[PDB]
Amino acid sequence: AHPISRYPVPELAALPDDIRQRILEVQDKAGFVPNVFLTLAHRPDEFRAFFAYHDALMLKDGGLTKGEREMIVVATSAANQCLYCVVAHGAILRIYEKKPLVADQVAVNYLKADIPPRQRAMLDFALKVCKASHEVNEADFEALREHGFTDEDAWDIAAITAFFGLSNRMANTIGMRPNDEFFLMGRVPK
Amino acid sequence: RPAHPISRYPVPELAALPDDIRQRILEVQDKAGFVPNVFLTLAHRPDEFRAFFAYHDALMLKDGGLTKGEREMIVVATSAANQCLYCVVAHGAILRIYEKKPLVADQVAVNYLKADIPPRQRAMLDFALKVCKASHEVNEADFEALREHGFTDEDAWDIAAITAFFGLSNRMANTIGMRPNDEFFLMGRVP
Amino acid sequence: AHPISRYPVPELAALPDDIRQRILEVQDKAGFVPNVFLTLAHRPDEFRAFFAYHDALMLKDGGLTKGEREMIVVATSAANQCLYCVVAHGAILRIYEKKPLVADQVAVNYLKADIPPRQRAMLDFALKVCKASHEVNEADFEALREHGFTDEDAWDIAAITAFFGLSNRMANTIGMRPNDEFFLMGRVPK
Amino acid sequence: AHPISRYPVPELAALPDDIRQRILEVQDKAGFVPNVFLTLAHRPDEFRAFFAYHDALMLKDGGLTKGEREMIVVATSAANQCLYCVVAHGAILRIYEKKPLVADQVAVNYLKADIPPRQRAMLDFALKVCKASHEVNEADFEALREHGFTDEDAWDIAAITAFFGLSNRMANTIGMRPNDEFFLMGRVP
Amino acid sequence: AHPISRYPVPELAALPDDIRQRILEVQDKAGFVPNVFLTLAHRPDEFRAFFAYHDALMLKDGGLTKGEREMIVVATSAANQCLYCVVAHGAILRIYEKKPLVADQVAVNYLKADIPPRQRAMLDFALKVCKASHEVNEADFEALREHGFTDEDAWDIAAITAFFGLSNRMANTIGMRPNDEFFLMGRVPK
Amino acid sequence: AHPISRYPVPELAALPDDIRQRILEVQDKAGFVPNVFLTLAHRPDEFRAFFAYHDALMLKDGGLTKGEREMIVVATSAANQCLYCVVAHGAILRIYEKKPLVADQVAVNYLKADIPPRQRAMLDFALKVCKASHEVNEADFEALREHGFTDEDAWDIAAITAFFGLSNRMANTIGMRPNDEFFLMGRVPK
């Protein structure tokens, strides 16, 4: 087995109960524990805040579909050359939208991915928040509204981009390894 | 003198907010004399507010190999690289206060390579900057370099975490037009 | 059926004998025709020279294994954000290496791929020929030689990088589309 | 004499005949042999594939003029800091255009070269293909059309950019040295 | 005390009297001698050429206000990450505009400083000369004219940018330290 | 005849006597007037300080030969893509060095110019001051000392680089044209 982190990966039995429950609850749904859970459990207080933030953005009722949210995470993680997040969320993207080819395209060159203008423009904003938020101006929000987004959708695209930047940096810094399961998941329909 | 807007987004009234959030805002006010705008602007999305400050507290309030000033120093250099006006200005004030060095935050914001800091701290910021702009390139030699200056790998995680979270903060700050309070600009400049 | 080129694509019948002969040869071996053949057959003389150059590099006897050559292609194409070549050779790399996870790693961040230092080094060089060839110097070759390569291997790396650099630009310019087959090919072992 | 490559340079004596032929042919219609032939003759198969592709682009009847083809090479090569190609095709550019100053301009900053907006628009594309092809969209082909180019012309511009990127990377990697003759050629009408 | 330069700082008594008078003139004007004077005096011919040029740009009567000229310096100095110039001219900018916040805003992100569109356009052009002067075209001048800048004002902007680009590089090369006084100057209005 | 500036070029009869004198002294010397003189004449106060700085550096006696000084200008100009300075000073460089090929080499890729390690090392420091002076450190000076350059020689390199970048920006902003004479000058010896 290849190491999943550069840092100590604690034993499920050594972890506090609430952390342990979130990990098991994810194993139940997924069938395995994604390595982000295990690797970030090295620092319990950060694990708690990381997933709290994650949930607040990814589980909320919002203008962005669950698929679109993961698509944001894939395009921005590509930009940061983040192995784990590209691979982990590429799979989920494929599942959530039932499009086996789309995550690959968004990761290699989203400019040429088989997605609609509304989504392309969604990502354009995400890439700007990612690499150059200092230049975010009113024309940027106008561009999103031209496609039916509200400014609250803008905040949403921005917040996902922001938080998965936190996550890409942590994953790259510790060499967080994507589970084998993610590499094939969502590629074969039905 | 009508005040400048602090966000391009709505700012809720302290009264129209959850008591837990209201209490955190009052605790910071009753200890600073004013409410930093990050609390009021993020209070537009209460669940994100709670998750932000909890993450913030986990890194900036823990016991650790980094001093309180050093942690703020990391924020200032990384924020300066992202050209985050709120963060550079807000955390420069706090850096000056913690270090008791009125000049250090401006040096770190403009070019930390010439800041009045020891090579241990310059090394710490070299790493922070790598995580900040090229984390995918982080390797074992980057950890070795920090260790050469007396850091442990647990300290290396603290640096990287702070960089990571304020890269989030920066991005939100910049997207919403988060405006630094007037008090930060002058705070810590007079010994 | 999405289009595979921004330019006209000719009918196999329409093409010269040797071109159709080369295309039939691959149709039979693979069970389909990669789009690169069809889309470049729009300009018969360039097709001829493109594939002659390709064969001279990828079919020669040499110090790089077939899978190492494809590895060079995935890492440099990722650099040029070439959807066609990343996806296409990504599949081919998985076949030759019998490693289903490697092509994704090489395409996203080859610095974290599951490859030995000799292969990392081979890629470090390729990446310099790709993005900064004017800086290539004697110490670059000396670095390779310390990993066991010969100067003739180094040329091979450089040459693959040069040629696929050409291919990336043609692919990208015309929006050459990777075949659906390539996205799953090599991910489930035989 | 300075070395023309960091790699071995075969003797014409020991080369396949078809390769000697094109070298000895160059020696007549030029009086000397550009180092690109001799340096790439180290690998005969690559030599053959390389010149065929070159001839396929540069010698075809097409929408771009001979001089315009060279102008694309000089500008893209200049962007890849390719000493060999900038200098060698700067010369040929001067010979075709009969304009001794144009290559230098195209090499330093084509944006200020003495050329009409049509040729500048063309080179704007060439430089997009050169450094950011993944971003090439319909608006780029539309831009060229406004100056009277067709999409076939765009392909030719892109293919020249693509090929000389190969040529540049090879030059740069082996230290291919421009012949002395190229530095002065075409500077006197 | 911290050294103000990597190089020797000549004593007054040792300097040519004309050079000594400019230094003593500013001592009276400011109440201290900015380290630019003291440190460049190491090379008297250059001190003369330098301050002559400075005065030709910053003392001329012309299109740009005195605060506007300082704004160009701080924003362009911020982009060459010049510690000395950013800090020194930020101080002056605060005084001339009577706006204690505007310098830090211009230094970090002029796009978000409290300045009219005219001043933003001005600095857009300054930053183009500063980082990409080779791309300066007629559309650049056209944009400026829309805000009230003549071609002679555009020259002034470019000229300031260019000269302070020289200044930044000497400051940066020698470690030209800013005077303690500039850090606090202009923050509490008179 | 192509315009030599985007701005007015004054007639020498219309200029101050000292300015007309300098302009006729160079004509005496060169047999033509470099367009830098005529175009900057548009601003006599700046013309004076500009040529006063130029002389302070280019005419001084110091550790750099006259050729090496031009070589710094051509390498750094080239990096600012300054048509005027590259072409003009390339010509001068050919003269001073009696090396017809050397300026082209330095202009395109100095890393491959026919120059010894000492000169390559002087240009490495020049390009650093040119594009990243904020990162100049004690090790860059040490690198120059190993090649025999003194503290004052380093200042000369840094100073020429700084001043010619002011020149590049000004040439670039006004579309300063180089004279037909510089294009062929020095390419043929004796």
**D33 neighbors D26 (Cβ within 8 angstroms):** yes
Question: Which stretches of chain A sit within 8 Å of chain B by CB?
Answer: 6-7, 43, 45-46, 48-50, 52-53, 56-57, 60, 80-83, 129-130, 133-134, 136, 138, 141, 151, 154-155, 158-159, 161-163, 165-170, 172-174
Side-chain half-sphere exposure of F108, counting CA atoms within 13 A: 34
CA closest to A90 among chain C residues:
C104
Could you give the CA distance from residue D80 to residue F120 in angstroms, rounded to a whole number?
Answer: 19
Residues of chain C positioned with their CB less than 8 A from the CB of F75: none
Tell me how close the Cα of D46 comes to any Cα of chain C, in angstroms. 6
- Beta-carbon contacts of F29 under 8 Å, excluding residues fewer than 6 positions away, are none
At A81 the three-state DSSP class reads coil
Q: Give E136-140's long-range contacts (Cβ < 8 A, gap of 24+).
A: E136/F172, E136/F173, E137/D111
- Beta-carbon contacts of D61 under 8 Å, excluding residues fewer than 6 positions away, are none
Could you give the CA distance from residue E71 to residue B46 in angstroms, rounded to a whole number?
Answer: 39
Q: How far is CA F72 from CA A119, F68, F160, in A?
A: 49, 6, 7
Q: How far apart are the first and last CA of chain C?
A: 29
**B46 neighbors B13 (Cβ within 8 angstroms):** no
DSSP string, chain C: ---S-SS----GGGS-HHHHHHHHHHHHHHSS--HHHHHHTTSHHHHHHHHHHHHHHHSS--SS-HHHHHHHHHHHHHHTT-HHHHHHHHHHHHHHHT-TTHHHHHHHHGGGSS--HHHHHHHHHHHHHHHHGGG--HHHHHHHHTTT--HHHHHHHHHHHHHHHHHHHHHHHHT-PPPHHHHHTTSS--
CA neighbor of B175 nearest in space, from C127, C137, A11, E109 = E109
What are E137's two structure tokens?
């075209």
CA closest to B139 among chain C residues:
C111
Provide the phi-psi class of B9: left if phi over 0, else alpha when psi is between -120 and 50, else beta. Answer: beta
Q: Give B94-99's long-range contacts (Cβ < 8 A, gap of 24+).
A: B94/B188, B95/B69, B95/B188, B96/B187, B96/B188, B96/B189, B97/B187, B97/B188, B98/B67, B98/B68, B98/B69, B98/B72, B99/B69, B99/B73
Could you give the CA distance from residue D21 to residue E86 in angstroms, rounded to a whole number?
Answer: 65
B/D Cβ contact: 3+ pairs below 8 Å: no
Put simply, the answer to whether A169 touches B62 (Cβ < 8 Å) is no
At E138 the three-state DSSP class reads helix
CA neighbor of B17 nearest in space, from B52, B53, B41 = B41
Could you give the CA distance from residue A104 to residue C104 in angstroms, rounded to a whole number?
Answer: 9
**A34 neighbors A4 (Cβ within 8 angstroms):** no
What are B123's two structure tokens?
């090394």
> Which candidate from D82, D83, D155 shows the least CB-CB separation from C7?
D155
CA neighbor of E184 nearest in space, from E106, E108, E90 = E90
- Beta-carbon contacts of B40 under 8 Å, excluding residues fewer than 6 positions away, are B6, B11, B12, B14, B25
Could you give the CA distance from residue D117 to residue C101 in angstroms, rounded to a whole number?
Answer: 49
Could you give the CA distance from residue A52 to residue B67 in angstroms, rounded to a whole number?
Answer: 26
Tell me how close the Cα of F77 comes to any Cα of chain D, in angstroms. 9
Tell me how close the Cα of B74 comes to any Cα of chain A, in angstroms. 15
**B128 neighbors B162 (Cβ within 8 angstroms):** yes
Q: How far apart are the first and last CA of chain E?
A: 29
Tell me how close the Cα of A143 comes to any Cα of chain E, in angstroms. 19
CB-count burial class (<10 Å; 0-12, 13-18, 19+) for B144? exposed
**E78 neighbors E106 (Cβ within 8 angstroms):** yes
CA neighbor of E164 nearest in space, from E172, E175, E152, E154 = E172
Length of chain E: 190
> Which candidate from B51, B164, B176 shows the least CB-CB separation from A56?
B51
**Angle subtended at Cα A141 by Cα A135 and Cα A146, rounded to the nearest 5 degrees:** 140
DSSP string, E61-82: -SSS-HHHHHHHHHHHHHHTT-
Q: How far is CA D126 from CA B20, D130, F61, in A?
A: 59, 6, 46
**C187 neighbors A187 (Cβ within 8 angstroms):** yes
All structural domains of chain A, each given as residue ranges with its CATH number in brackets, are 11-63 (1.20.5.810), 64-190 (1.20.1290.10)
Put simply, the answer to whether A82 touches B135 (Cβ < 8 Å) is yes
CA neighbor of A181 nearest in space, from A31, A6, A25 = A31
**E67 neighbors E96 (Cβ within 8 angstroms):** yes
Residues of chain B positioned with their CB less than 8 A from the CB of F134: 111, 113-114
**C164 neighbors C73 (Cβ within 8 angstroms):** yes
CA neighbor of F161 nearest in space, from F95, F69, F83, F93 = F69
CA neighbor of E48 nearest in space, from D43, C79, F49 = F49
**D159 neighbors D57 (Cβ within 8 angstroms):** yes
**C92 neighbors C34 (Cβ within 8 angstroms):** no
Provide the phi-psi class of A89: left if phi over 0, else alpha when psi is between -120 and 50, else beta. Answer: alpha
Could you give the CA distance from residue F168 to residue E128 in angstroms, rounded to a whole number?
Answer: 13
Length of chain B: 191
Q: Name the resolution in angstroms.
A: 2.2
What are C121's two structure tokens?
């080094």
CA closest to C115 among chain A residues:
A2
**F93 neighbors F114 (Cβ within 8 angstroms):** no
At B105 the three-state DSSP class reads helix
